[PDB]
mmCIF file of C-alpha atoms and ligand atoms in Angstrom:
data_model
loop_
_atom_site.group_PDB
_atom_site.id
_atom_site.type_symbol
_atom_site.label_atom_id
_atom_site.label_comp_id
_atom_site.label_asym_id
_atom_site.label_seq_id
_atom_site.Cartn_x
_atom_site.Cartn_y
_atom_site.Cartn_z
ATOM 1 C CA UNK A 26 200.037 94.296 55.514
ATOM 2 C CA UNK A 27 201.822 96.117 52.386
ATOM 3 C CA UNK A 28 200.557 99.743 51.345
ATOM 4 C CA UNK A 29 201.488 101.505 47.763
ATOM 5 C CA UNK A 30 201.298 104.847 47.563
ATOM 6 C CA UNK A 31 199.693 105.432 44.384
ATOM 7 C CA UNK A 32 196.933 107.056 46.058
ATOM 8 C CA UNK A 33 195.841 108.721 49.418
ATOM 9 C CA UNK A 34 196.847 105.313 51.987
ATOM 10 C CA UNK A 35 193.283 106.098 53.610
ATOM 11 C CA UNK A 36 192.199 102.903 56.021
ATOM 12 C CA UNK A 37 189.379 103.026 58.442
ATOM 13 C CA UNK A 38 190.619 103.664 62.107
ATOM 14 C CA UNK A 39 187.482 103.227 65.183
ATOM 15 C CA UNK A 40 187.910 105.700 68.476
ATOM 16 C CA UNK A 41 184.968 105.812 71.097
ATOM 17 C CA UNK A 42 183.110 102.926 69.214
ATOM 18 C CA UNK A 43 183.575 104.830 66.251
ATOM 19 C CA UNK A 44 184.712 103.655 62.281
ATOM 20 C CA UNK A 45 186.272 107.060 60.407
ATOM 21 C CA UNK A 46 188.639 107.363 57.943
ATOM 22 C CA UNK A 47 191.776 108.567 58.325
ATOM 23 C CA UNK A 48 194.795 109.317 56.046
ATOM 24 C CA UNK A 49 198.510 107.604 56.848
ATOM 25 C CA UNK A 50 200.657 110.279 57.079
ATOM 26 C CA UNK A 51 204.494 109.604 58.284
ATOM 27 C CA UNK A 52 205.437 112.875 57.914
ATOM 28 C CA UNK A 53 203.118 114.042 60.630
ATOM 29 C CA UNK A 54 204.766 112.897 65.141
ATOM 30 C CA UNK A 55 201.333 113.168 66.126
ATOM 31 C CA UNK A 56 197.606 111.511 64.892
ATOM 32 C CA UNK A 57 195.044 114.515 64.621
ATOM 33 C CA UNK A 58 191.164 113.635 64.258
ATOM 34 C CA UNK A 59 188.278 116.469 63.440
ATOM 35 C CA UNK A 60 186.639 118.105 66.218
ATOM 36 C CA UNK A 61 185.153 114.650 68.413
ATOM 37 C CA UNK A 62 183.792 113.822 72.051
ATOM 38 C CA UNK A 63 186.972 111.937 74.134
ATOM 39 C CA UNK A 64 186.506 110.975 77.861
ATOM 40 C CA UNK A 65 188.630 112.431 80.389
ATOM 41 C CA UNK A 66 191.290 115.724 81.063
ATOM 42 C CA UNK A 67 192.478 117.340 77.767
ATOM 43 C CA UNK A 68 196.027 119.514 77.990
ATOM 44 C CA UNK A 69 197.167 122.337 75.762
ATOM 45 C CA UNK A 70 198.488 121.646 72.113
ATOM 46 C CA UNK A 71 200.560 123.351 69.383
ATOM 47 C CA UNK A 72 200.665 121.548 66.179
ATOM 48 C CA UNK A 73 202.685 122.498 63.582
ATOM 49 C CA UNK A 74 201.890 122.194 59.609
ATOM 50 C CA UNK A 75 202.319 123.180 56.226
ATOM 51 C CA UNK A 76 200.021 126.552 56.744
ATOM 52 C CA UNK A 77 201.298 127.519 60.080
ATOM 53 C CA UNK A 78 200.971 126.383 63.733
ATOM 54 C CA UNK A 79 197.527 125.872 65.447
ATOM 55 C CA UNK A 80 195.632 125.256 68.933
ATOM 56 C CA UNK A 81 194.538 121.743 69.294
ATOM 57 C CA UNK A 82 193.155 119.378 72.715
ATOM 58 C CA UNK A 83 195.573 116.438 73.454
ATOM 59 C CA UNK A 84 193.940 113.345 75.007
ATOM 60 C CA UNK A 85 196.217 110.426 76.667
ATOM 61 C CA UNK A 86 196.173 107.483 76.540
ATOM 62 C CA UNK A 87 192.981 106.497 74.493
ATOM 63 C CA UNK A 88 192.520 103.762 72.700
ATOM 64 C CA UNK A 89 192.332 103.058 68.675
ATOM 65 C CA UNK A 90 192.044 101.047 66.651
ATOM 66 C CA UNK A 91 193.627 101.032 62.966
ATOM 67 C CA UNK A 92 192.899 98.753 60.178
ATOM 68 C CA UNK A 93 192.155 96.210 62.836
ATOM 69 C CA UNK A 94 195.390 96.418 65.209
ATOM 70 C CA UNK A 95 194.656 98.150 68.363
ATOM 71 C CA UNK A 96 196.819 101.219 69.871
ATOM 72 C CA UNK A 97 196.781 103.640 73.097
ATOM 73 C CA UNK A 98 198.041 106.094 73.032
ATOM 74 C CA UNK A 99 198.087 110.149 72.401
ATOM 75 C CA UNK A 100 194.870 112.055 70.353
ATOM 76 C CA UNK A 101 194.778 114.935 69.403
ATOM 77 C CA UNK A 102 191.548 116.770 68.132
ATOM 78 C CA UNK A 103 190.546 120.364 66.337
ATOM 79 C CA UNK A 104 190.616 121.572 63.845
ATOM 80 C CA UNK A 105 192.780 119.179 60.928
ATOM 81 C CA UNK A 106 191.764 118.552 57.340
ATOM 82 C CA UNK A 107 191.397 115.483 57.558
ATOM 83 C CA UNK A 108 191.830 112.397 60.092
ATOM 84 C CA UNK A 109 195.734 111.467 60.633
ATOM 85 C CA UNK A 110 197.385 109.127 61.851
ATOM 86 C CA UNK A 111 201.167 110.431 62.410
ATOM 87 C CA UNK A 112 203.974 108.716 63.575
ATOM 88 C CA UNK A 113 203.341 108.258 67.531
ATOM 89 C CA UNK A 114 200.365 105.395 66.321
ATOM 90 C CA UNK A 115 202.284 103.690 63.060
ATOM 91 C CA UNK A 116 204.670 102.587 65.751
ATOM 92 C CA UNK A 117 202.327 101.073 67.903
ATOM 93 C CA UNK A 118 200.983 98.991 65.113
ATOM 94 C CA UNK A 119 204.925 98.115 63.980
ATOM 95 C CA UNK A 120 204.886 100.295 60.388
ATOM 96 C CA UNK A 121 208.153 101.152 58.489
ATOM 97 C CA UNK A 122 208.846 102.731 54.747
ATOM 98 C CA UNK A 123 210.659 100.260 53.042
ATOM 99 C CA UNK A 124 211.940 100.744 49.104
ATOM 100 C CA UNK B 21 216.565 99.881 52.761
ATOM 101 C CA UNK B 22 213.936 99.516 56.171
ATOM 102 C CA UNK B 23 213.395 103.215 57.292
ATOM 103 C CA UNK B 24 212.178 103.419 60.884
ATOM 104 C CA UNK B 25 209.606 106.227 62.262
ATOM 105 C CA UNK B 26 210.498 106.022 65.423
ATOM 106 C CA UNK B 27 212.033 109.058 64.096
ATOM 107 C CA UNK B 28 211.427 111.095 61.637
ATOM 108 C CA UNK B 29 211.818 109.776 57.936
ATOM 109 C CA UNK B 30 214.692 112.286 56.615
ATOM 110 C CA UNK B 31 216.673 111.205 53.940
ATOM 111 C CA UNK B 32 219.843 112.853 51.980
ATOM 112 C CA UNK B 33 218.141 114.177 47.656
ATOM 113 C CA UNK B 34 219.887 115.643 44.825
ATOM 114 C CA UNK B 35 218.215 117.885 43.260
ATOM 115 C CA UNK B 36 219.356 120.979 40.884
ATOM 116 C CA UNK B 37 222.934 119.799 41.438
ATOM 117 C CA UNK B 38 222.353 120.305 45.100
ATOM 118 C CA UNK B 39 222.077 118.393 48.574
ATOM 119 C CA UNK B 40 219.282 118.952 50.365
ATOM 120 C CA UNK B 41 217.239 116.894 53.894
ATOM 121 C CA UNK B 42 213.732 115.408 52.986
ATOM 122 C CA UNK B 43 211.033 114.304 54.500
ATOM 123 C CA UNK B 44 208.917 111.395 53.476
ATOM 124 C CA UNK B 45 205.108 112.074 53.930
ATOM 125 C CA UNK B 46 202.900 109.104 52.674
ATOM 126 C CA UNK B 47 200.735 111.726 53.744
ATOM 127 C CA UNK B 48 201.101 114.730 51.042
ATOM 128 C CA UNK B 49 200.464 114.006 47.734
ATOM 129 C CA UNK B 50 203.597 116.424 46.067
ATOM 130 C CA UNK B 51 206.364 116.963 46.744
ATOM 131 C CA UNK B 52 206.830 120.800 47.672
ATOM 132 C CA UNK B 53 210.682 122.491 48.834
ATOM 133 C CA UNK B 54 212.084 125.960 50.468
ATOM 134 C CA UNK B 55 212.658 127.463 48.454
ATOM 135 C CA UNK B 56 215.426 127.629 45.287
ATOM 136 C CA UNK B 57 215.997 127.741 41.678
ATOM 137 C CA UNK B 58 214.767 124.419 39.051
ATOM 138 C CA UNK B 59 214.990 125.276 35.384
ATOM 139 C CA UNK B 60 211.610 125.534 32.619
ATOM 140 C CA UNK B 61 208.457 126.832 33.151
ATOM 141 C CA UNK B 62 206.025 126.628 36.431
ATOM 142 C CA UNK B 63 202.657 127.446 37.229
ATOM 143 C CA UNK B 64 201.402 128.873 40.925
ATOM 144 C CA UNK B 65 199.136 126.728 42.982
ATOM 145 C CA UNK B 66 197.675 126.874 46.489
ATOM 146 C CA UNK B 67 198.319 123.641 48.655
ATOM 147 C CA UNK B 68 197.030 123.389 52.289
ATOM 148 C CA UNK B 69 197.163 121.583 54.802
ATOM 149 C CA UNK B 70 197.263 122.386 58.707
ATOM 150 C CA UNK B 71 196.940 126.121 59.304
ATOM 151 C CA UNK B 72 196.618 126.520 56.112
ATOM 152 C CA UNK B 73 197.892 127.403 52.732
ATOM 153 C CA UNK B 74 200.469 128.505 50.906
ATOM 154 C CA UNK B 75 201.051 129.627 47.446
ATOM 155 C CA UNK B 76 203.644 127.663 45.596
ATOM 156 C CA UNK B 77 205.660 127.223 41.992
ATOM 157 C CA UNK B 78 204.614 123.884 40.217
ATOM 158 C CA UNK B 79 207.808 122.569 38.691
ATOM 159 C CA UNK B 80 207.442 120.110 36.174
ATOM 160 C CA UNK B 81 209.205 116.824 34.759
ATOM 161 C CA UNK B 82 212.083 117.492 36.958
ATOM 162 C CA UNK B 83 214.631 115.135 38.243
ATOM 163 C CA UNK B 84 215.583 114.200 41.427
ATOM 164 C CA UNK B 85 216.837 111.185 43.554
ATOM 165 C CA UNK B 86 216.391 110.001 46.513
ATOM 166 C CA UNK B 87 218.471 108.261 49.205
ATOM 167 C CA UNK B 88 220.178 107.103 45.827
ATOM 168 C CA UNK B 89 216.691 106.265 44.044
ATOM 169 C CA UNK B 90 216.006 107.971 40.072
ATOM 170 C CA UNK B 91 212.776 109.722 39.774
ATOM 171 C CA UNK B 92 211.196 112.511 37.532
ATOM 172 C CA UNK B 93 208.307 114.036 38.313
ATOM 173 C CA UNK B 94 206.486 117.652 39.109
ATOM 174 C CA UNK B 95 208.138 119.574 42.407
ATOM 175 C CA UNK B 96 206.177 122.366 43.859
ATOM 176 C CA UNK B 97 208.561 125.839 45.921
ATOM 177 C CA UNK B 98 207.333 127.518 48.147
ATOM 178 C CA UNK B 99 207.275 128.962 51.875
ATOM 179 C CA UNK B 100 207.413 125.072 53.391
ATOM 180 C CA UNK B 101 208.255 124.663 57.051
ATOM 181 C CA UNK B 102 210.577 121.694 55.303
ATOM 182 C CA UNK B 103 210.945 120.313 52.176
ATOM 183 C CA UNK B 104 208.711 116.553 52.155
ATOM 184 C CA UNK B 105 208.470 114.114 49.551
ATOM 185 C CA UNK B 106 204.868 113.564 48.598
ATOM 186 C CA UNK B 107 203.656 110.416 47.223
ATOM 187 C CA UNK B 108 203.946 111.557 43.221
ATOM 188 C CA UNK B 109 207.495 111.136 44.123
ATOM 189 C CA UNK B 110 207.321 108.073 46.580
ATOM 190 C CA UNK B 111 205.774 106.053 43.901
ATOM 191 C CA UNK B 112 208.110 106.616 41.605
ATOM 192 C CA UNK B 113 211.095 104.604 43.688
ATOM 193 C CA UNK B 114 208.816 101.924 44.746
ATOM 194 C CA UNK B 115 207.870 103.079 48.658
ATOM 195 C CA UNK B 116 205.370 101.221 50.555
ATOM 196 C CA UNK B 117 204.105 101.028 54.082
ATOM 197 C CA UNK B 118 204.746 98.169 55.594
ATOM 198 C CA UNK B 119 203.072 96.599 58.627
HETATM 199 C C1 AKC C 2 200.023 116.857 61.589
HETATM 200 C C2 AKC C 2 199.812 116.337 63.287
HETATM 201 O O1 AKC C 2 201.470 115.618 63.633
HETATM 202 C C3 AKC C 2 201.763 117.317 63.336
HETATM 203 C C4 AKC C 2 201.068 118.054 62.243
HETATM 204 O O2 AKC C 2 201.759 117.465 60.689
HETATM 205 C C5 AKC C 2 202.152 117.965 59.865
HETATM 206 O O3 AKC C 2 201.262 118.452 60.092
HETATM 207 N N1 AKC C 2 203.069 117.572 58.579
HETATM 208 C C6 AKC C 2 202.719 117.680 57.567
HETATM 209 C C7 AKC C 2 204.127 117.750 57.399
HETATM 210 C C8 AKC C 2 205.085 118.758 58.230
HETATM 211 C C9 AKC C 2 204.599 120.524 57.518
HETATM 212 C C10 AKC C 2 204.876 120.515 58.225
HETATM 213 C C11 AKC C 2 206.032 121.117 59.124
HETATM 214 C C12 AKC C 2 206.686 119.379 59.539
HETATM 215 C C13 AKC C 2 206.037 118.399 58.927
HETATM 216 C C14 AKC C 2 201.955 116.461 56.838
HETATM 217 O O4 AKC C 2 202.062 115.409 56.224
HETATM 218 C C15 AKC C 2 200.420 116.994 57.321
HETATM 219 C C16 AKC C 2 199.186 116.518 55.877
HETATM 220 C C17 AKC C 2 197.886 116.131 56.327
HETATM 221 C C18 AKC C 2 196.580 116.256 55.332
HETATM 222 C C19 AKC C 2 196.625 115.409 54.814
HETATM 223 C C20 AKC C 2 195.818 115.670 53.257
HETATM 224 C C21 AKC C 2 194.791 117.287 53.174
HETATM 225 C C22 AKC C 2 195.340 118.115 54.173
HETATM 226 C C23 AKC C 2 195.923 117.922 54.814
HETATM 227 N N2 AKC C 2 199.704 115.426 54.958
HETATM 228 C C24 AKC C 2 200.218 116.475 53.690
HETATM 229 C C25 AKC C 2 199.473 117.692 53.903
HETATM 230 C C26 AKC C 2 199.768 119.061 52.568
HETATM 231 C C27 AKC C 2 201.458 118.850 51.962
HETATM 232 C C28 AKC C 2 202.199 118.541 51.948
HETATM 233 C C29 AKC C 2 202.995 118.473 51.048
HETATM 234 C C30 AKC C 2 202.157 118.693 49.571
HETATM 235 C C31 AKC C 2 201.609 119.227 49.410
HETATM 236 C C32 AKC C 2 199.773 119.313 50.038
HETATM 237 C C33 AKC C 2 198.894 119.313 50.282
HETATM 238 N N3 AKC C 2 198.039 118.359 49.251
HETATM 239 C C34 AKC C 2 198.033 117.054 50.182
HETATM 240 O O5 AKC C 2 197.820 115.789 49.667
HETATM 241 O O6 AKC C 2 198.560 117.106 51.309
HETATM 242 C C35 AKC C 2 198.635 119.007 51.538
HETATM 243 C C36 AKC C 2 199.738 117.895 55.021
HETATM 244 O O7 AKC C 2 199.605 119.143 55.747
#
């Protein structure tokens, strides 16, 4: 699909059997989701944003569907303003910018 | 052009008579650049994201060239970690997400 940018590029994702709204964010290297429960062990990660560097929990090899496309990769969990789908998963679904 | 997301989507922009490197960010409503001088009047604004909020100066009707594509729009100037081209200008150059 082709997504224009006149509005926020919000899509529905599926993770842990539940649906959530997320933002396709090309300016984000990683994917960060609002507080939720994920399986397995996690490692610490510091991510930098417009307002500063914060701490999140890093989970690897997590199943996540983005707009119907299945992906398996790293998902960070922390106090993010919105669910963000970053380049690590955008590349898995074959996303590119065009103009 | 078709820009890959294997790396950060960085491009050259021309604004105020000078060349700079900026990040194409679909997850940002606005465009914000590191401290620089711009012509015309401005109003204060607070923008927030990962890490919190930062105070910026809002300049309207500013001419900019992104990857050789001319456009006009609002440009915020402040202590952003990186130059960011947001949706307000990405739409003007016909930028879309595809997958
Ligand atoms: C994020 C996980 O991987 C690592 C984190 O990557 C980042 O934090 N990347 C930065 C970009 C970046 C910052 C520092 C260093 C490199 C890149 C942004 O792309 C992330 C984000 C997420 C977001 C989206 C909607 C609302 C809140 C937060 N998307 C947009 C905003 C803000 C933003 C940015 C510019 C202008 C106005 C605004 C605001 N108004 C608005 O619409 O969005 C807000 C972000 O922080």
